[model samples]
Target chain A: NNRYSFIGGRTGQWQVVKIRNVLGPGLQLVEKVNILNGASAWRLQGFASNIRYAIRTELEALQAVQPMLNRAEAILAVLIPIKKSAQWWEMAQDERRDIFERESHHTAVGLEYLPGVARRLLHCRDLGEEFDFLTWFEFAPEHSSAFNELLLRMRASKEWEYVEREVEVWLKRL
Target chain B: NNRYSFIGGRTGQWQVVKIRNVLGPGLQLVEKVNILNGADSAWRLQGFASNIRYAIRTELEALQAVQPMLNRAEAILAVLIPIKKSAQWWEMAQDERRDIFERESHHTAVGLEYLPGVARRLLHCRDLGEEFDFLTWFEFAPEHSSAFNELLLRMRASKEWEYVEREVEVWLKRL
Candidate 1:
């Protein structure tokens, strides 16, 4: 199972960089959080299941220019959990796509900082989790500034207006 | 007391006009929606929205430099647009929506190039509980028709347009 568990409140190989409460309550403050990617990864803390792309054309284009996650130099990590408002869910898929790409240029904006900030988006809404999407990003320490700028661009986008709740956690490899 | 009504039933000084439904339920298809100068009409006019009023005084000032006043001597084309935003749009804090309107969509800046040609007035109606949230009135000469259409096309394509729930466009020509 490609499901990943973010086990907080436990000691782990990853060091706690920082945890921020952006718009809502945040995760439990811990020195470390384990990243276990399998069905057997204990304690049901936070789970994000892998799913097929909701957007195909954009994803295909993204895949062509973007780098895959888990690069050896990517020792820093940031996890963001987001849940949009009911109105966001009420929009038809096509309408949502209009806001995400055609209007906001979400994929296009991220393409600027491409391979520097390796990232993955996982779903948790179907599992009845607090967040609808879990976004994990990894980058080398030298590219941290680019990663931060990328977050700024996304938060300032039109698509982010629908975000009702969000929490960000920063981590570093021990 | 400051309220103005747009009467569609009766004939007026303005010529019978074209009405188009940009989105959702539309107004009566009468030849025109009369624009009463004052508050005595039997019919109520559709009304307003914006978040960039305070932050963009300089921008507006720049726009005002070239913007022609409404009812210019040579200006014959007139358009009234009634639009309402989604509940989510209204719920957002002013600055939040301002980012979408100006920062992301560049709503005002985009019109700078078309300035002076298209004179406009934004009437407030969201507070009035009227049919629409905003009534945007515009007047331009027939020569600027293409420029006006181009402005509309660019404005409609912006990210800010996603919040628009209902919009009705009324076009008129002063006789």
Candidate 2:
């Protein structure tokens, strides 16, 4: 029920957002990359789900402070797709969860930057795509640096060690 | 001193090692990539690491806590990877390199994830008139071997790897 599409081409309502090839070959750049909430003609696609990787307290904390997507002032957006190595996929769910929370503090770190950097995580791995997850973030220009700092902290965490490929696409509504 | 040598071909203390030419023209596929433990004919190389270069105050503190020392009995697998960065990487100032190294690529941060799972030592040979600029040594238990490989793959995919011009990997099993 949580499917979405990211259509990129010569058409869309969003303005300039550089496609930064962070770690691997990812979505190619086009004039505009539009986000549609459901299935559509797509250059890229992903789906949302319950916190499949979080624990009770972690889920509780996230839901309490998280903000909804697309506020009036929240015009800036960053969309990224990530792929983990085979070894990472081979690990058991509990083991992966250990790396995600206890060792990396992934949710914990994000909690600190919350409400400001509204975000959602969509999975593409189940759909047989090359990337595992597509993360979409929205925030006001004032929180741009805060979002970047949040990324720096996450990248430094132990969980990022499993990320073999990733790409960032920045965008603005016109 | 941290200075050490890797002497190969028909000699050395460590035994039964396989040389994998991962990238670039590496040493000939030979009998050993042995550690002299204490070098000259087949493929001799020497290097010594200086102090940690780019770690900030918080990172240094975190590493001091979580980073384990080398040579645990369970850690029987070892690897020596030699690399040379392109001239373009060396031409940049220290700050620029630091930006790519940590800010963008988060090199140290990525390494932090493996923690006590993998142990490593880095030998810098750039100024030593050696063939390679750096030799990275790693060790992990058999169970953690996949994780070690994953770590290497992750680092190789980072933005910083754009500057790596040459590399060779040597995998070893302690006898």
Candidate 3:
């Protein structure tokens, strides 16, 4: 069973107290302002089981793989959110499979960049969030540019027009 | 030291990638594909193609005395809004930009309205890619989501918004 929390902006100015008083109805007003500096994208908490996939779902590589990674000694994490164009989905599922394999190299490229960047996907559309997937990655402070380049390469494909939303985020380990 | 990360979004074809690839370069490369059931609706900036006309805050403000929005294991709402400025906006003087940002439009004032209840973090995404001048993020709970939207309505209706070209509002949660 997979789950996604219901997920889903603003600006400035004076009269700080009047601002805190404008709470909406029917929900909890939890806040987190002590967190200063860099911010990561937001994600909802939810799960799904009947979801679809285009890549191989089985493997034991991440285990033996970690020891060989440089980030294994690093102390930070990364999370990214992405949304694909429905036009890409409008095509036949088999067509997407072909594009996924040969075009986006959806699997092979990942095989080439494991342990260096551990990844996971969290589904969000199941909730009211604006994005569809929450993608998480962990890497050493040293590997930042390689990841950005990989992203550039992937989006460079005939595949990315389908990528309507892709936001970058940086995080630290707890 | 405050930190932020992007989160959430589309399609049904995501999975736990069980693989590894070390790098010699200074970055990471991870990819994903799709099986879209529905796409989230995209939004364009709603104001005019104009620039601001104000006084700059030549000096910094209360941020020096601010505290970090520490993360606790609690349910919360976070929103990432990427907004781009127009060529006209870019041509403005720093003080002019500052005026639109604060005095003329009350950008800072509107935000301070809901500080802790509607906390936010601003990231400089300019020249990074699609080049949204700023990637603004907001965090709140379900109760304040309405208040968050209320704040949104207020900002979009301001003179500063006249220079906002493209924008997208995405949401997420921390549990």
Candidate 4:
């Protein structure tokens, strides 16, 4: 089967490309990365089936969540590409957990914001997609500030020190 | 009060970015466009994507009479799309590839039909990021959205698409 996604919509499941032959830029481009070419591929760590504790497991707060996301005329899905420092990854699993949990209070902060904001974490390093992680966030314009506050809190924590690269992409729904 | 949108969804209306910052394999970059730094060189990021910018410039020169459309904008769609043409595409020669990208390829001509409606600034990102090779950003007012859709439809119909590998199109709006 062709790997293309003919689906429509922004979150359309698969991405499609149109190949117009003869690249007109820079001329003979000699360098490139192909997974088959042995370049580093990217990996997703926590999205979907690769469940992690930071995500909400119980739906007790479902009702409280509706109003927060109701008025948002747009959605800001950020692709925060990040890679942790090797030093941080070298830590014991329990030690890392302590920082990501207790010290950073990641789950608590998310729980506090509750219904207004939503998020998802996608891993991209293993697949060679660039950076090491894909941290996506969603919230109404009213809660935009609240979302920023969440980022500030997390960035201030020791956990953020290991974040090496991050690029934010902002998208609004039509 | 502002036309700028901060909300997002799969079918988002707009996307935006304020480019700045320095280079690192992956650092905490917050702004800045690397038009000069070439450690990995943005142009060589993909097999079929490399040096495609120059080809576009050439196309525009032939259509210079319509070059004015590049700046007119009321509903700007500062889009960021990362595209990877497949290994199969790269295997083809530069001349044969023209149909997919240049004169033989109507991607340029179709946009011309929109005239001053859609303004675009195509940027190359493959050299810097692993996700996509080209950063295709476009602008047109809300009234022109339908025409924009038409432009998109005609362009995607080209034959060169069979080799495409990955695409992450982030539609943004003016800040």
Clashes of 4: 59
Name the best candidate (by lDDT): 2
TM-score of chain B of each: 0.89, 0.92, 0.63, 0.60
- Runs with alpha carbons beyond 4 Å of true place in candidate 1: A1-174, B40-43, B46-55
CAPRI band for model 4: incorrect
Candidate 2 deviant stretches above 4 angstroms: A40-42, B1-175
Best by TM-score: 2
> For model 3, what is the C-alpha lDDT against the true structure?
0.48
* Tens digits of lDDT, candidate 3, B14-108: 22122122111111112222222222312211111111122122211332233237342232556656677777876554445655777689875
Q: Across residues A1-174, which tens digit of lDDT does each residue of candidate 3 receive?
A: 334332211211111111111111111222211121111123235233222333223134334453332244544444455666667645544465557666777656766666577666665543444565766666776777777677767777777767776654444443
The CA lDDT of each predicted structure is 0.73, 0.78, 0.48, 0.46
Candidate 4: lDDT of B84? 64
**Taking the candidates one at a time, how many backbone clashes does each contain?**
5, 0, 63, 59
Writing each residue's lDDT as its tens digit, candidate 1 over A28-112 gives: 6787877777532223323432122234455566778777777889899988889887787655434665687778888788889
Candidate 4: lDDT over CA atoms?
A: 0.46
True contacts kept of each: 0.00, 0.00, 0.00, 0.00
Model 2, residue pairs in steric clash: none
Q: Is 1 or 4 the stronger prediction by TM-score?
A: 1
**Model 4 lDDT per residue over A14-98, tens place:** 2212111111111111111111111212222322213222323222343445343223543443334467776765554345656
* Model 3: DockQ score: 0.01
* Reference-based lDDT, residue A66, model 2: 90
